Amino acid sequence: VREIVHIQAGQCGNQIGAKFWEVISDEHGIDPTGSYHGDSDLQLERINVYYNEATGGKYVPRAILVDLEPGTMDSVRAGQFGQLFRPDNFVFGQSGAGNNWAKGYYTEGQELCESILDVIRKEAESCDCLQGFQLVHSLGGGTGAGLGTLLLNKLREEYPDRILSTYSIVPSPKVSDTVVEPYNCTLSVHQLVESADEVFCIDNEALYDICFRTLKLTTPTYGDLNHLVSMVMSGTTCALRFPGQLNSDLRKLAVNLVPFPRLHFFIVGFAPLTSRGSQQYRALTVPELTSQLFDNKNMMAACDPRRGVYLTASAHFRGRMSSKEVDEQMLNIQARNTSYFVEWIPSNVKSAICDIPPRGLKMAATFIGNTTAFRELFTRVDSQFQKMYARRAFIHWYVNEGLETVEFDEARSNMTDLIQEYEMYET
Amino acid sequence: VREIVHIQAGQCGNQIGAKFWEVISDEHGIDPTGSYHGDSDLQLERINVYYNEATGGKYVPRAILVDLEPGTMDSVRAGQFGQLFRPDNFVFGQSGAGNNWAKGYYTEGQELCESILDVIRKEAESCDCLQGFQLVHSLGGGTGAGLGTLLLNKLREEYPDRILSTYSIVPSPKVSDTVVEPYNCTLSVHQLVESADEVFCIDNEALYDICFRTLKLTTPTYGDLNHLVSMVMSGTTCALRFPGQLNSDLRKLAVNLVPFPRLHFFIVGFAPLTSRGSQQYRALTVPELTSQLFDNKNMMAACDPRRGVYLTASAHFRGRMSSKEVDEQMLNIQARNTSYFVEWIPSNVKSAICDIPPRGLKMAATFIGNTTAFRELFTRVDSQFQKMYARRAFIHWYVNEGLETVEFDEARSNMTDLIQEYEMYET
Amino acid sequence: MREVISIHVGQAGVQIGNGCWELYCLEHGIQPDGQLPDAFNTFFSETGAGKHVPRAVFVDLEPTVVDEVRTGTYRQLFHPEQLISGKEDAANNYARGHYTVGKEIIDLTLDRIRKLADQCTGLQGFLIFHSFGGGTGAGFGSLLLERLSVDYGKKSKLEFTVYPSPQVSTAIVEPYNSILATHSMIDHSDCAFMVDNEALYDLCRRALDIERPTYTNLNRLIGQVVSSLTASLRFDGALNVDFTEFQTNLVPYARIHFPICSYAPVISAEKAYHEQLSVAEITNSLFEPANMMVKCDPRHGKYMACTLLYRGDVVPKDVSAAVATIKTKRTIQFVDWCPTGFKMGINYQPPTVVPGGDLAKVQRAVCMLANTTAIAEAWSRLDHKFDLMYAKRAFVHWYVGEGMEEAEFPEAREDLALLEKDYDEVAAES
Amino acid sequence: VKILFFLEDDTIEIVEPRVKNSGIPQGTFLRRHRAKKDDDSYVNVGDFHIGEEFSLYGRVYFIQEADKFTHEFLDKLNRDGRTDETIPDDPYIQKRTLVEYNETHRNR
Amino acid sequence: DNIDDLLIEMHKWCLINSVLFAEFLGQFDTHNNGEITAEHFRTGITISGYKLTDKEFQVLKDYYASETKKDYVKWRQFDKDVKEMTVPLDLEKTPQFNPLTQAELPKVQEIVKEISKFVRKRRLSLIEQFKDFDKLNHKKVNASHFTRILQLIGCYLSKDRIDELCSFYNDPYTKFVDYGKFCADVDEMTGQL
Ligand SMILES: Nc1nc2c(ncn2[C@@H]2O[C@H](COP(=O)(O)OP(=O)(O)OP(=O)(O)O)[C@@H](O)[C@H]2O)c(=O)[nH]1
Numbered sequence A, B: 001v002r003e004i005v006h007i008q009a010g011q012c013g014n015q016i017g018a019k020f021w022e023v024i025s026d027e028h029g030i031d032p033t034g035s036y037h038g039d040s041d042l043q044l045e046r047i048n049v050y051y052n053e054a055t056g057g058k059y060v061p062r063a064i065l066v067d068l069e070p071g072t073m074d075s076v077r078a079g080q081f082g083q084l085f086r087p088d089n090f091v092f093g094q095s096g097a098g099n100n101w102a103k104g105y106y107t108e109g110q111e112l113c114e115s116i117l118d119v120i121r122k123e124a125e126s127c128d129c130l131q132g133f134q135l136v137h138s139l140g141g142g143t144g145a146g147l148g149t150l151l152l153n154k155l156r157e158e159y160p161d162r163i164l165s166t167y168s169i170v171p172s173p174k175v176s177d178t179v180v181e182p183y184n185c186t187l188s189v190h191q192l193v194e195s196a197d198e199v200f201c202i203d204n205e206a207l208y209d210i211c212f213r214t215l216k217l218t219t220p221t222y223g224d225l226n227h228l229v230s231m232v233m234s235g236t237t238c239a240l241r242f243p244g245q246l247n248s249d250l251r252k253l254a255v256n257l258v259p260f261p262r263l264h265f266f267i268v269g270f271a272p273l274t275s276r277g278s279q280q281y282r283a284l285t286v287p288e289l290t291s292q293l294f295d296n297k298n299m300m301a302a303c304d305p306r307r308g309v310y311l312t313a314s315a316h317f318r319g320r321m322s323s324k325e326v327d328e329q330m331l332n333i334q335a336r337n338t339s340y341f342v343e344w345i346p347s348n349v350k351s352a353i354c355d356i357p358p359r360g361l362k363m364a365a366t367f368i369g370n371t372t373a374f375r376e377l378f379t380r381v382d383s384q385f386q387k388m389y390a391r392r393a394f395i396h397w398y399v400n401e402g403l404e405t406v407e408f409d410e411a412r413s414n415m416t417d418l419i420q421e422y423e424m425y426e427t
Numbered sequence C: 001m002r003e004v005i006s007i008h009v010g011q012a013g014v015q016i017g018n019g020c021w022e023l024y025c026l027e028h029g030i031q032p033d034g035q036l037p038d039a040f041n042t043f044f045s046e047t048g049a050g051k052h053v054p055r056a057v058f059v060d061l062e063p064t065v066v067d068e069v070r071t072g073t074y075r076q077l078f079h080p081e082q083l084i085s086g087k088e089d090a091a092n093n094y095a096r097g098h099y100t101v102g103k104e105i106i107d108l109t110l111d112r113i114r115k116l117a118d119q120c121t122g123l124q125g126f127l128i129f130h131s132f133g134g135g136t137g138a139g140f141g142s143l144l145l146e147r148l149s150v151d152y153g154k155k156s157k158l159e160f161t162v163y164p165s166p167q168v169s170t171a172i173v174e175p176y177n178s179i180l181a182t183h184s185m186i187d188h189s190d191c192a193f194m195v196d197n198e199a200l201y202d203l204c205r206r207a208l209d210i211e212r213p214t215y216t217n218l219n220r221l222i223g224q225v226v227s228s229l230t231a232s233l234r235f236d237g238a239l240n241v242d243f244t245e246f247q248t249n250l251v252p253y254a255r256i257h258f259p260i261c262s263y264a265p266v267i268s269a270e271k272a273y274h275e276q277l278s279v280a281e282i283t284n285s286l287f288e289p290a291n292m293m294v295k296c297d298p299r300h301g302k303y304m305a306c307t308l309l310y311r312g313d314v315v316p317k318d319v320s321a322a323v324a325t326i327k328t329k330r331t332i333q334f335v336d337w338c339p340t341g342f343k344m345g346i347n348y349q350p351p352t353v354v355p356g357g358d359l360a361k362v363q364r365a366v367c368m369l370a371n372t373t374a375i376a377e378a379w380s381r382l383d384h385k386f387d388l389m390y391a392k393r394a395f396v397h398w399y400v401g402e403g404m405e406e407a408e409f410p411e412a413r414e415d416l417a418l419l420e421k422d423y424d425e426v427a428a429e430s
Numbered sequence D: 001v002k003i004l005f006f007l008e009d010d011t012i013e014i015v016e017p018r019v020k021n022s023g024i025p026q027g028t029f030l031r032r033h034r035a036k037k038d039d040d041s042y043v044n045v046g047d048f049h050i051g052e053e054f055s056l057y058g059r060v061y062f063i064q065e066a067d068k069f070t071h072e073f074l075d076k077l078n079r080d081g082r083t084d085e086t087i088p089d090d091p092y093i094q095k096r097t098l099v100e101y102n103e104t105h106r107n108r
Numbered sequence E: 001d002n003i004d005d006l007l008i009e010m011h012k013w014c015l016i017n018s019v020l021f022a023e024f025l026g027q028f029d030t031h032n033n034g035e036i037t038a039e040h041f042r043t044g045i046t047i048s049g050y051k052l053t054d055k056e057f058q059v060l061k062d063y064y065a066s067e068t069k070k071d072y073v074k075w076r077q078f079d080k081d082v083k084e085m086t087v088p089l090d091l092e093k094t095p096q097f098n099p100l101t102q103a104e105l106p107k108v109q110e111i112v113k114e115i116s117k118f119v120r121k122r123r124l125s126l127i128e129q130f131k132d133f134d135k136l137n138h139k140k141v142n143a144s145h146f147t148r149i150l151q152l153i154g155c156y157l158s159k160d161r162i163d164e165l166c167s168f169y170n171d172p173y174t175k176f177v178d179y180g181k182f183c184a185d186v187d188e189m190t191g192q193l
C-alpha cells in the first residue's frame, strides 16, 4: 500500500504515458478492456499501487492527462489502450500550445491549474496511502515546460512529504524541433531545482544512438524510442510491486544517491539491449549485464561519464540470481576504475534485487547514477541562451504575457551556480 | 397498511405524476395493462399503499388528476401507462387556466373544488388506514398554484391528523416561463406556511445544471427532468413499501427535521448520479454516496447551503450495507464541517436504512435537509414582486376576479416575516 | 520449564528467523501446521488441541518480507499477532527508524513481547537479531533495546547481528547507521555476537562446495550456530551450559563482551565419506582463520576465554586431549591472566539435516564462541570510513531532518573511540 | 529465402529478401558453390520437389513455390506440384504492421 | 510421489516465475560431464528458489540416477527435460509448433440456484462483501470466514451443504475457499442486477 500517482503533460508526456501504460498493463496482465486476464496470483498481490478497482472487476489506473489543446487527447482516445483511462481524468484546454513558457505559465496555466488540482485531489485522497507523485513531461516544449512546472510548485505546497520524482526530456544540442528551446529549458530549471526531489534527464539523441548501434533498426520510430524510456520507469518501481532478496523503494533510492539537496540530477540506462538477430548468439549472465550498465554507450543522456567523475550510483536487478555474483561485480567495477569515483565517499555503488523479471527476459537491470557530467549538458543551453538573450527582441513574445525581463537574469543566475555547484564538488 | 392518496394539479403535476406512476409500476412490476407480471414475492407485501384492486386481478392507482383545461388530461390519457388510471378520477374544467391566481382561486376554483372533494373522499375512505396525502403542483402557474392552495385548506379542515406532504416547483427567477409568476408565488406562500406539514422545493435551474454537469446530456427534455424528481418521492415512501434494518416513514421525518412549526421548507438531494459514459469506471461505495449528497452541486434547489447554516439533515439508504459504515459517515461529515451546523442542536444528521434498492442500482441514497439558505430563494421573488408592486403592474387583471388589493400586502408581509424567521435562528 | 524468547528485526532478521525456525521444526519433529505425525516447551507452546505455536515475534516497518511468511508454507504455524508489519520502511536511515516512524510502532510491539512472556514461566533471556546497515535493524533496534532494558532489567539480552563487511557493501550510508547503533548496543546488551556476509561467502564456497550462493544458504548456516548454542537447554548431555554460563565465562569486563563465532565441521557429502571427523580433527579446524565467521585474523590479536560446545558421539576423554593439544599451538596466543581459557559443553543430540539441505549428516560437531582482541581490527575499518564521509558532511541533511540532533554524530564517534581504547588497554599483559 | 539453382554446374545459391526494420543482416545466405547433401553427395535437380523439406548445412528449408520458367522446365521432367501451404505468418511482422496500422488506417 | 505431475508443477512454477535452471546446475559441473553429485543437486534446487519436498527429491534422484557412478544425477538431462516443455531446440527443423502465447496461458448447482434466488429477490452483489477478509488481494479466504459471511447476508442454509460448496470451490494451493469464481457463478445464475 504505497500508491503512486502518475501525471502526464503535453504532447511528449502523453505519448510516453500511453506507451508506458502498455508496459505495466502487460506486466500485470490487464486486458485493454480493463479486466484482469493474467497468469499468476503474484500479479494481484500489490496491483493497488497503480490501479484502482471499479465495481465489476475492472481496473483503472491512477493517471492524469494534461494538455492545452485537445489534439493530443483525441489520439490517446483512439489508441489501443484508450478505453483503460478514466474519462474524467482527461483535462484539456481550448487554446493552442503556443510553444511559449510565459504564456503557458501565466495566461493559460492559472485557469487549468485549479481545475487540474481538484482532479488530483480525487485520486490523491482516494487510497489508503500515497508514497509520491510521478511526472513525465518535456522541457523544450510549451505546455509541459510551462504548466508542468506550475503544477510542480502546487503539489509541493499541499503535500510536502511525498516524493516528487520526475522524468524530463532535455532539448537536443545538435538538431532540435524548436527555435525557442533555450528560454523554456532555462526558465524551467529554477523551478525544478528547488521543488523536485529526483530528476531523470533523457535525450532523444541518445535514444537514436541506441536504436542504430545496439538494436540495428533501420528506421527508428517514436514507438521504439518511447519503449526504451518506459522500461526504465517500470524498473524503478518494481521493488514495491514484487518481492525480492533485498527491497529498495524510491525513498531508499533518494537517500543513497543524494548527498546534498541541490545535487540530485541523475543519468539513467538499461540493460540488456540486443539486436533481434544477435540475441541467439549473446550469452546473458550477471557479468554481461554489468558490462552494459557502466558502458557509456548505453546512457540515455548524451553526457559521457568519462569526462567527469561519479558521486553515487545505484543498480537494480530482476530475476532469481546469485547474491554473491551481484556484490562481486559492484566491488570490481569500483576498484577497477578508481579514477572515475570520488575518494571521500567509499562504497559508491548501491545494489538491489527483485524476484520477478519482465516477460521474456530471464534477468534485467536498471542503472541510476549521479555524476558531474551534467556540467556538459547545461553548458550547451547556457551558451546558446547568451547568444539569443543579447538579441533583446525574441523576449517580445514573453513580455506580452507578463514575464519581466529580470526573470531571464534570475533564470540565468541560478543554473550558472548549479554548474558551479558541480564544479567544486569534483574536488 | 399506511395508504397514501395522490393528488396532481396542473400541467406540471400531470406530467410529473404520469412519470412517477411509471417508476412505481416498474419497481413493483405492474404491467401497463394493469396486472402483476413481476419477479419477487416481496413486491406484493405492501402494494396496497399505492394501489387498489379491481375484481379480476387488475390494480389501479390512488390518483386524482386536476386541471382547468382538458388539454393536459388527453396528454396523460394517450401515454404509455395512461389506461392504467381509473376512468372517473379525471376531474377537469372547460375554461382556460389564464395563469391568474385570483381567477384560479375564486372563479373556477370554487366550481371545481366541490366536485374534486368527493372524488378524494372515495379514495380517502376506501382503505383500512390513511397516513397522508401527496400533492404535486407548481407555484408559478395559475392552476396548480391557485386551485392547489384552495384544496390544501379544505383537506386540512376535514383531515387534520393526516400528513399533507407537498412537492412544489418554485418559479425560477430570470428564467421562468411567464411574466406574472411573482404574483402567483407570493399569494400562494401564505396558504402553504400554515396548512402544509412538509414542503419540498425544486427549482428548474438545478435540474438543468445537474443534467449538463453530471448526466452529460446535450438535450435535456422534460422526460429526463421529471425522471430525476420521480426518484426522490419514490425514495421517501420506500420505507413504507419494503422492510429494512431501521425504518423511517413520513411522520418520523417531520418530527426530526422540523424544530418549529413554520420552519419546515426543505431541500432534497439524490445520489448516485453518473453519466452513461462513466458509470462503469465509478467505484460505488457508501462513502462515495455520502460525497455526492452533501456536495453543494447535487441539490435540486438553486440555493447554495454554504451561504447559510444547517439546522436538520436526514439521509436514507437502500441496499444490503453495513450499519457501522453508514453511522460513521454522519459523525465524520458533521465533525468536519462544524462551521455549517447550529451548535444548539447536536447530532443534526438523521438516518434510515431500507433493504431493497431500485432496479439497476446496487445501492442508492436520498437526502432531505433544512437550511437557512432558503432566505436566498425568497429574497429573489420578494425583490421581483416589489418592482411589480411599485407601478401596480398587472394587478388590474387580479382585481376584476375579486381579489382585494390588501391581499397583496398581507401576502408580502407574511413572507417578509418568514425570511426574518430564518434570520433569527441563524444565531 | 526453561524457555527462550526470540525477536527478529529487519528483513535480514526475518529471513534469518525463517531459516532458524525451519531448523527448530524438523529438529523436534514438528509439522508445518504445528502437529505431530521432550523440550517442545523450551521453544513452542501447546495450544491447539494437538498444536504447537512458536515463541517468536517478527518486526519490520514494511509488509513485503512479513507477507511472504503470511503467504508462505509455514503460515499456519504462527499466531497473527506474532507477525507485525509496518507501513513504510526506514529507507536505510537511522533517524527515520528511531524517532519519527519507529516511535509510531514501538509501543505496539512491546505489548506483544510482554504478552508472550506471561505464558513463559521459565524465561531465561531474549535472542535479538539485527542488520546494522539496515534502517529498521539499527534505528528501530536501538529503540527496542533501550525500552527492553528498563522493562525487565536483569534478564539476559543476547544479540546475533550482521556486522558490515570489510569491503563488500550494498548501502552507501552503511557506516553512519553502524556507529550510531554501536553506542546504543554497547550499554544495553548483555552479550552481542557478530557475523558478516563477506566471511560467510568465502566459507560456503571453499569448504562447502557451492559456486554461487544466495542469502538462503547463508541463513541456513546461521541456523546451525543457534541450534548448537541452545542444544544444552533442550537435550540430554554430560556437560550442560546455561545462558548465565556463556556470559559469565566469555566476558571478563562489561564493555569487552563482543565474541566471535565459528562452526566445525562444515563439509560436503562427498568429502565426508573420506575423512574420519575425529574430535581432534574437528577441533583443529575451528582455530584456523579460514573457518572464522568474521573476516578478522586472530593472529593479529590474542585470545581471551573461549567456549566449546560438542554434540553427539563426543566423549569427555577426546575433548580434554584435543584441548590439551590446542594449548601446545604456538600459532595461538593467550593473555597471561587467563591460563584456564576454556569451558566445554557436551550434548548427545546430533545436528539435523534439512529438506533441500546444504550440509552432510555428520555424527559429531562442535561450535565455538570466543572473545579476541582481533575484533578491534573490524572497528578500525568502520571508524576510518566514517570520518571520510563526515569530514565533508556527505549525508548529514537526511539524518537531521528526521529528528536527530547533529551533536549525536560526534558523541557516537567518541563512544567508539573509547571502546577501541578499552580493547587495547586490556590486550596488554602484566 | 529465395533458392537459386544453376543447371550449368549444379551449384546452389540462397538469398534472403531484405525486409524493412528486420534487425537481421539480410542478403546472400549461402554463396554459389556445389552443395553436398547430408549423405556426402552433391545436390541435383533430382532432389528438388515443390512441397518437400530440403535440408542443407544443419538447416531445413521447406520448398513453397516455384518460378514460372522453373515450373516449365520441371514440367518437362514431371516434377511439378502445387501445395496449398502458404508461408506461415511472422508474428513480429504482424504486430509491427498493426502498430503501423494504428498510425495510418482510419479516423473515419 | 509422481514424476510426471511434479514435472508439470515445476514447469508451471517456471512459467510463472520465468526461471531457468541451466544457470544454477551448470556451476557444479567442473568437468562438463553432464553429471553432478546428488547432494549438490539438492543444494541447487533450494538455491533455485523452489521449496521441493523430500518425497519429490528421492523420486527425482531415483528416476535420473546414473549408471556410470554411485548417486550421480544427470543434471543436463533433467535441465533439458524442463526446457523442452517450453520449446524444442530443434526448431531449425521445420515441423514443430511453438506454444505461441495462448498455449502457455448436481448437488452444488441446486445450492447455487437457491443462492441465485436469494440474490435476484434481494438484488445483492456478493463480490463487494467478501472483501473484508481477503487481505493481500489473493481473493481466497479461510473456509470459516467464507461460511461466516454467507449468513451475514442471511441465507441460513444447513451446515452440511455449506461445507459441500467449500469442498467443490476449494482452492488447492492455499486450501482456502476461492470466492472469485464463486461470485462470478452466483451473479451469472442470478442474471441482470
Ligand atoms: N546474511 C544475510 N544478510 C542479510 C539477509 N537479508 C538482508 N541482509 C542484510 O541486510 C542489509 C539490508 O538491510 P535490510 O535487510 O533492509 O534491513 P532493515 O533494517 O530492514 O533496513 P530497512 O529496509 O531500511 O528498514 C544488507 O546489508 C544485508 O547484508 C540475509 O538473508 N542473510
Ligand SMILES: Nc1nc2c(ncn2[C@@H]2O[C@H](COP(=O)(O)OP(=O)(O)O)[C@@H](O)[C@H]2O)c(=O)[nH]1
Residues within 6 Å of the ligand: A009, A010, A011, A012, A015, A016, A097, A099, A138, A139, A140, A141, A142, A143, A144, A145, A146, A169, A176, A177, A178, A204, A222, A225, A226
Ligand atoms: N521522445 C519523444 N519525444 C517527443 C515525442 N513527441 C514529441 N516529442 C518531442 O518533445 C519536444 C517538445 O514537444 P512539445 O509538443 O512542444 O511539448 P509540450 O508543448 O510541452 O506539450 C519536441 O521537440 C518533440 O520532438 C515522443 O513521442 N517521444
Ligand SMILES: Nc1nc2c(ncn2[C@@H]2O[C@H](COP(=O)(O)OP(=O)(O)O)[C@@H](O)[C@H]2O)c(=O)[nH]1
Residues within 6 Å of the ligand: B009, B010, B011, B012, B013, B015, B016, B097, B099, B137, B138, B140, B141, B142, B143, B144, B145, B169, B176, B177, B178, B204, B222, B225, B226
Ligand atoms: N420540471 C418541469 N416543469 C414544468 C413541466 N411542465 C411545465 N413546467 C413548468 O411549470 C411552470 C408553470 O406551469 P403551468 O402551465 O402554469 O402549470 P399550471 O398552472 O399548474 O397548470 C412553467 O414555468 C413550466 O416551466 C415539466 O414537465 N417539468
Ligand SMILES: [Mg+2]
Residues within 6 Å of the ligand: C010, C011, C060, C061, C062, C089, C090, C134, C135, C136, C137
Ligand atoms: Mg526494514
